[PDB]
């Protein structure tokens, strides 16, 4: 039902398992236990990743889809997180 | 229609 994703600075993000599976990496890691550590992703990035999971699930097979806001100054970190997570 | 993956969205945030 829920999984816990732990950022490099120790914040714990508790997310619906179905939403976390947006990440190919999380899916493979969970294939059982429900906790995953991301020792190279800080909480200001992982929090945004979790918002993406929610948004991705809510708007799949959508009508016009609202913008996912990404400030330029975190775009590169977000990209590297999304590379690692495969989402 | 589904949202683009986050890899592509993060790229567009700097490319466009």
């Amino acid at each position: 039902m829920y999984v816990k994703l732990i950022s490099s600075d120790g914040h714990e993000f508790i997310v619906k398992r179905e939403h976390a599976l947006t990440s190919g990496t999380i899916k493979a890691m969970l294939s059982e236990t429900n906790e995953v550590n991301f020792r190279e992703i800080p909480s200001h990035v992982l929090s945004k990743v979790c918002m993406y999971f929610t948004y991705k699930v809510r708007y799949t097979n959508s009508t016009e889809i609202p913008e996912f806001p990404i400030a330029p100054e975190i775009a590169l970190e977000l990209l590297m997180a999304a590379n690692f997570l495969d989402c | 229609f589904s949202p683009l993956c986050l890899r592509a969205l993060a790229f567009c945030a700097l490319a466009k």
């Binding site: 829920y2 914040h11 508790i14 979790c50 918002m51 929610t54 809510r58 806001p69 | -």
Partner: protein, 92 residues
């Protein structure tokens, strides 16, 4: 109509959603299933304002314009010893 939330205490953040017409008590029931503290041992907050168990989330100010999937609203959470409301900020 669904509202999208982050329920935050210390270094815990729960991502969850609920209907705008659900009540504060029903949201505490969601928190109980995750963190195993019953509703009477929870205080929920919007900023520094305590939320009454009988109010709907919409009456508390959580609507589809202020609580969106890509930008969820924050609900503070404190447990009974009540501890002070304390949310650790994300990194910079």
């Amino acid at each position: 109509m669904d509202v999208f939330l982050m329920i935050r205490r210390h270094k815990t953040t729960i991502f969850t959603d609920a209907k705008e017409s659900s009540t504060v008590f029903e949201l505490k029931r969601i928190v109980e299933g995750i963190l195993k503290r019953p509703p009477d041992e929870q205080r929920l907050y919007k900023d520094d304002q305590l939320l009454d168990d009988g109010k709907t989330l919409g009456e508390c100010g959580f609507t589809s314009q202020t609580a969106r999937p890509q930008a969820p609203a924050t609900v503070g959470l404190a447990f009974r010893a009540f501890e002070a409301l304390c949310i650790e900020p994300f990194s910079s």
